[PDB]
Structure formats: structure tokens, C-alpha cells
Amino acid sequence: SEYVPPKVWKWDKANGGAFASVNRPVAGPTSERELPVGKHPFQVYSLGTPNGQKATIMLEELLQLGFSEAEYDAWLIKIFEGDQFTSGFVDINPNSKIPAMVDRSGPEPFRVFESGAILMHLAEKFGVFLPTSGPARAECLSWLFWQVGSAPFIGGGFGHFYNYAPIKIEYAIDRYAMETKRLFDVANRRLAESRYLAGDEYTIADLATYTWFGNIYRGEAYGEAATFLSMHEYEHVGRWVGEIDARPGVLRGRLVNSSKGLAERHDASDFDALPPESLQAIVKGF
Amino acid sequence: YVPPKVWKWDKANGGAFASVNRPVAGPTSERELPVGKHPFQVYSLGTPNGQKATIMLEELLQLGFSEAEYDAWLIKIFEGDQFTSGFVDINPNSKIPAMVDRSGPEPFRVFESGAILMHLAEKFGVFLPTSGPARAECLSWLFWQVGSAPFIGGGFGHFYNYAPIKIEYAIDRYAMETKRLFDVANRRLAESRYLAGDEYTIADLATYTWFGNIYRGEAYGEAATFLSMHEYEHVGRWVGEIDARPGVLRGRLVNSSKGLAERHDASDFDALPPESLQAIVKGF
Numbered sequence: 383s384e385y386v387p388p389k390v391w392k393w394d395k396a397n398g399g400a401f402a403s404v405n406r407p408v409a410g411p412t413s414e415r416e417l418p419v420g421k422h423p424f425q426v427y428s429l430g431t432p433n434g435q436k437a438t439i440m441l442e443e444l445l446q447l448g449f450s451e452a453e454y455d456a457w458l459i460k461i462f463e464g465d466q467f468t469s470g471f472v473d474i475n476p477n478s479k480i481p482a483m484v485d486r487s488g489p490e491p492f493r494v495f496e497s498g499a500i501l502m503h504l505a506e507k508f509g510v511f512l513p514t515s516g517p518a519r520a521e522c523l524s525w526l527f528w529q530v531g532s533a534p535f536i537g538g539g540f541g542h543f544y545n546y547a548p549i550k551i552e553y554a555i556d557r558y559a560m561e562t563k564r565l566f567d568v569a570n571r572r573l574a575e576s577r578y579l580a581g582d583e584y585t586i587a588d589l590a591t592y593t594w595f596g597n598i599y600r601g602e603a604y605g606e607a608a609t610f611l612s613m614h615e616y617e618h619v620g621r622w623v624g625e626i627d628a629r630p631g632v633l634r635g636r637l638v639n640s641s642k643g644l645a646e647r648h649d650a651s652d653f654d655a656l657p658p659e660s661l662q663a664i665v666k667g668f
Numbered sequence: 669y670v671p672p673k674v675w676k677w678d679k680a681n682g683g684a685f686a687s688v689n690r691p692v693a694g695p696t697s698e699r700e701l702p703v704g705k706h707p708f709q710v711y712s713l714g715t716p717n718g719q720k721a722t723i724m725l726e727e728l729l730q731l732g733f734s735e736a737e738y739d740a741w742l743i744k745i746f747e748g749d750q751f752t753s754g755f756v757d758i759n760p761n762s763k764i765p766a767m768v769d770r771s772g773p774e775p776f777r778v779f780e781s782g783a784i785l786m787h788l789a790e791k792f793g794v795f796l797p798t799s800g801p802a803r804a805e806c807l808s809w810l811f812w813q814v815g816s817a818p819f820i821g822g823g824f825g826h827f828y829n830y831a832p833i834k835i836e837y838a839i840d841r842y843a844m845e846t847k848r849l850f851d852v853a854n855r856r857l858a859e860s861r862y863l864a865g866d867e868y869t870i871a872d873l874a875t876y877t878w879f880g881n882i883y884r885g886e887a888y889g890e891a892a893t894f895l896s897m898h899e900y901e902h903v904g905r906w907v908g909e910i911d912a913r914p915g916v917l918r919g920r921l922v923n924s925s926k927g928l929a930e931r932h933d934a935s936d937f938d939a940l941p942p943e944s945l946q947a948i949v950k951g952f
């Protein structure tokens with residue numbers, strides 16, 4: 383018979399599949415441990431998921447343009463193991479999610495958390511990948527906030543119910559597969575008539591959406607999702623993914639804090655530990 | 669059940685929203701948007717997300733910024749108004765709120781509540797530090813709100829209040845996450861008056877519309893009891909402080925069944941009984 387929710391919700395059962403070892407109804411630190419700090423002006427604490435890739439790609443894009451103040455240390459945070467709940471991590475992101483960073487480029491350090499805030503902070507600092515004024519700024523912000531507000535349906539809904547939940551729940555898989563397809567259709571309809579999401583040039587709105595959409599579209603995210611969701615239908619998404627795939631900052635940034643690349647980045651020469659081909663073409667994750 | 673190799677749109681989904689939710693985007697009717705006299709044209713509904721936009725504009729009017737005068741036209745989301753050609757042209761995602769900035773020589777769209785908040789805060793130089801570390805703190809909390817409300821509304825609200833069958837695993841997932849998010853805010857507000865510092869900013873406004881509506885018992889049936897809202901005393905303090913702001917008291921009523929269907933001039937509020945603008949009862 384049908385489940386009847388209690389009057390008062392209680393945390394009486396594991397939830398999250400593999401993530402049941404970390405998912406809780408309360409926030410805060412579970413151990414006292416300071417974060418490591420390197421020599422570079424930006425300190426990033428992350429994992430090479432689509433959200434971590436936004437941050438490390440952005441920094442590599444800035445280095446591609448010659449901005450030495452974008453040099454960074456990218457320290458590995460293993461989210462299945464609860465590294466996001468150390469006191470040091472909670473102090474830089476009260477929400478205990480990656481990516482989070484400390485801007486140590488000025489006289490006093492300060493935290494920046496949330497991938498969208500990291501992208502906007504870096505774009506504003508260096509004056510690139512985000513129009514500084516005018517209608518084009520509003521268009522870019524609209525698409526960036528769209529990405530941030532919609533990825534929860536893609537990863538927290540579809541990815542979870544399709545690939546991590548311990549039981550396959552038809553209503554939930556249908557809900558979030560449908561919504562993920564709708565979001566791809568929004569992008570596809572836009573990219574039919576515009577080279578990039580917020581205009582004719584690559585911006586942070588593209589980078590933010592690309593990490594998620596490219597990983598799903600090319601077949602590397604959530605099991606058989608690309609077949610399940612009929613990714614072939616989104617040919618304009620495919621074109622735009624292909625354009626962005628070719629950018630050197632994307633090729634480098636995708637490899638940071640990645641099981642297919644570097645565990646950590648502490649200097650530009652660190653990439654010489656990888657096969658050189660990894661810097662020249664997309665490497666799909668496991 | 670066993671998912672098929674290829675997902676097909678062959679079953680209803682969405683419960684109360686089953687008549688509007690689709691796997692495809694784009695318009696379902698040809699209709700132009702109405703346009704009024706004021707510099708900002710808002711197309712919205714007084715849900716927590718619409719309230720962000722109309723409260724922000726009312727906050728700006730409280731500060732005397734006449735360029736924040738606005739027309740707020742009603743978009744009925746259960747009726748598919750978000751899929752007219754005119755609405756899709758200002759928000760390709762077909763969600764409220766969306767806006768047209770007609771304050772300058774050429775009009776342009778702004779869509780997403782967070783982008784609307786940032787656009788207005790940057791235009792008028794208020795509710796968002798213009799530079800310095802405090803700007804980064806504000807942006808962090810604003811993006812946090814935008815990235816987490818989907819779990820509260822699209823997860824918890826959906827499965828607890830709108831889905832046709834109660835699904836234990838899904839209710840647990842999103843009840844747990846909603847409580848975690850309230851706990852993040854509660855732990856912050858234990859040590860800070862507002863989320864991003866000592867002053868009210870757009871990060872507070874964005875979070876407040878959602879958190880206050882739930883905390884006070886107004887959203888999602890018995891959710892406030894279900895989620896033990898009493899546990900979050902610092903959230904309660906902050907809700908009560910923001911509840912008292914004159915711009916909140918006005919803006920929360922715009923495009924609302926319990927207030928004004930539409931707003932086309934400041935005097936529109938005079939048509940309501942004066943009690944409508946009076947102190948919000950606590951539960952904060």
C-alpha cells in the first residue's frame with residue numbers, strides 16, 4: 383500500500399546511494415583540520431566533476447591569456463570521503479560543496495564559494511569572459527544563473543535517480559529525464575540561432591553550461607544517459623560542445639583533480655606527468 | 669521497474685504540474701506581451717521567485733529611485749502563459765520571473781531571479797557591495813540560494829506536496845537536503861546578522877522569500893511541522909527582521925492571490941485593506 387509520511391520527518395534511514403556515507407540533514411564540520419595552502423594567488427579546493435571543472439578551466443583560460451595572477455593551487459577534496467566537512471573546508475564554504483576557493487591575490491585572503499560566484503569573481507577581476515556593462519552583460523548573467531539554477535535537476539535529480547539511487551523509481555526518473563531533455567532543448571533552440579549562449583562569443587555562461595552538457599552529451603556522465611536521453615537530437619549543442627572542446631584552457635582545466643588526469647595542480651609543469659596526448663584532445667572520464 | 673534503453677514521453681508526469689511539464693522547450697501559442705508606461709516591465713507570479721523581483725523593485729522605490737517604477741503583469745503558470753511566443757522571447761526557459769529593462773534607449777531582457785536581482789542591484793548601486801571581499805561573500809550566498817532552491821521546491825515541494833504518489837525515498841532525500849540547507853543558514857545566522865555580512869543584501873532577499881514562506885507555515889501543506897522548522901531559531905530571527913521591511917510587505921503582495929493581481933502604480937496598494945500591509949504574524 384502507499385507510503386504515508388509521518389507527522390515529523392526523522393533521519394531513520396540512509397539516503398543517497400553511494401552518497402549515503404556523507405548525506406545528512408545537518409550541516410557543519412565533523413573534524414578539525416586546516417586546509418593546505420600553496421604559493422599561488424588562488425587556492426582552489428575541488429574535485430574534477432563538472433562543477434570543479436568550471437573553476438579549473440576558468441583559471442586555465444586566464445593563464446592562456448597571460449594573466450599570471452590567475453596562477454593557482456588546486457587541492458583534492460574527495461567528496462565521497464567527507465573531506466568537504468573538515469573545519470578548514472567548512473570555513474571556506476559553509477555549504478560543504480566543491481568547488482570552493484580562497485583569493486590570496488591581495489593583502490587579505492577571502493573565500494569565494496559556489497562555482498557561479500567563482501566564475502563571476504574571476505571574470506570581473508580580469509575583465510574577460512563577461513561583458514563589463516551594457517545589455518550583453520544582462521544576457522550573460524541570465525544564462526549563467528540559468529545554468530546554476532537548472533543543474534540541480536540534471537545532477538541532483540536525473541543523475542541521482544538514474545545512476546545512484548539504490549532502487550529505480552519510474553516517476554522520479556521520468557520527472558528528471560524529462561526536465562533534463564527540456565533544458566537541453568532550451569540550449570539547442572538557442573544555439574540554432576546563436577553561436578554561444580549569451581551572444582556571439584564564449585563567456586562564463588558557456589563554460590558553466592558546457593562542463594555539464596558536454597560531459598553528458600559525449601557519453602561520459604551517468605552510465606548510459608546519452609543513449610537514454612537521445613543526445614543525438616541536440617545537434618546544435620553538439621556543435622557548440624565541439625567548438626569549446628578545442629580550447630586549450632578547456633583541455634588543460636578538465637584534467638585537474640581528475641582520475642583521468644592530475645590529482646592536484648601546483649604548477650604549470652605538473653601536466654608533464656600525463657601522456658602528452660591528454661593535453662591535445664578530450665579524455666572521457668571513467 | 670527497469671528503465672528502457674531510450675526514454676520516451678509516453679506517460680504523464682508532474683502531478684499538479686502534469687499539464688505544463690514537457691521534455692521539449694518552445695512556445696505553444698502566439699501572443700505578444702503587454703507593455704506599460706514604467707521603465708521596468710516584469711512578467712511574473714507571486715511565488716517565492718516572483719517575490720524576489722517585486723520586493724527588489726519595491727525596496728528600490730523605498731530608497732527613492734524613481735527609475736525602479738515598474739509594471740508587473742501576471743503570468744499564470746498553471747495555464748501555460750509561460751509558453752506564449754512573447755514570454756519565450758524574454759525567457760527561453762519559460763519560467764517566471766522575467767523582465768524587460770525599458771529604462772534606456774533600447775529595451776533588453778533579463779531572465780532568472782538571480783540575474784534580475786544582480787541587474788537591479790548593479791544599476792542602482794545598493795544591496796550588493798560594488799567591490800571588495802564583501803562583494804565575493806554576497807555573490808557566494810546569492811549563487812548558493814539559486815543553486816539550492818531546486819532541491820527545496822523542485823525536490824521537496826514536488827514530492828511532498830505535488831506528486832500524485834508519496835514516494836518515501838524521494839521525500840526523504842529532499843526533506844533531508846532541505847533541512848541541511850536550513851541548517852547552513854541557521855549556523856551562519858547564529859554568528860552574522862545577515863547571510864553575507866552585517867547588512868541586508870540581495871543574498872538575503874533571494875533566500876528569504878523561500879525560507880520565510882516555509883518557516884512561517886505558508887508553503888507546502890504541513891511542511892513546517894514535517895521539517896521541524898522550530899529548530900532553526902536564527903533563521904526565525906532573520907525572517908522576522910526581513911518581514912518588517914516596508915518594501916517586503918509591499919513586494920510580497922504583487923501578482924498574488926492574497927494581494928494584487930498586477931501592479932501598475934504605487935497607488936494600486938491603496939485598493940487593499942490596510943491590514944494587508946501589516947506585520948506578518950510569527951511563526952516569524
Ligand SMILES: N[C@@H](CCC(=O)N[C@@H](CSSC[C@H](NC(=O)CC[C@H](N)C(=O)O)C(=O)NCC(=O)O)C(=O)NCC(=O)O)C(=O)O
Pocket residue numbers: 398401404405431432433434461466478479480481495496497498530532533534536537538539541542811812815816
Ligand atoms: N551550486 C553548487 C553545486 C556544487 C556541488 O554540487 N558540488 C558537489 C560535487 S559536483 S558532482 C554533481 C553534484 N552531485 C553531488 O554533489 C552528489 C552528492 C549530493 N549530496 C547528492 O546526494 O546529490 C550535483 O548534482 N550538483 C548539482 C548542481 O551543481 O547544481 C559536492 O561538493 N557535493 C558534496 C556533498 O556533500 O553533497 C555550485 O555550483 O558550486
Ligand SMILES: N[C@@H](CCC(=O)N[C@@H](CSSC[C@H](NC(=O)CC[C@H](N)C(=O)O)C(=O)NCC(=O)O)C(=O)NCC(=O)O)C(=O)O
Pocket residue numbers: 527528531532682685688689715716717718745750762763764765779780781782814816817818820821822823825826
Ligand atoms: N532558477 C529560476 C527558477 C524560476 C522558476 O522555477 N519559476 C517557476 C515558478 S516559481 S514556484 C517554485 C518552482 N516550482 C515550479 O516551477 C513548479 C513547476 C515545475 N515545472 C515542476 O515540475 O517542479 C520551483 O521549484 N523552482 C525551483 C527554483 O526556484 O530553483 C515557473 O515559472 N514554473 C513554470 C514551469 O513551467 O516550470 C529562477 O530563479 O528564476
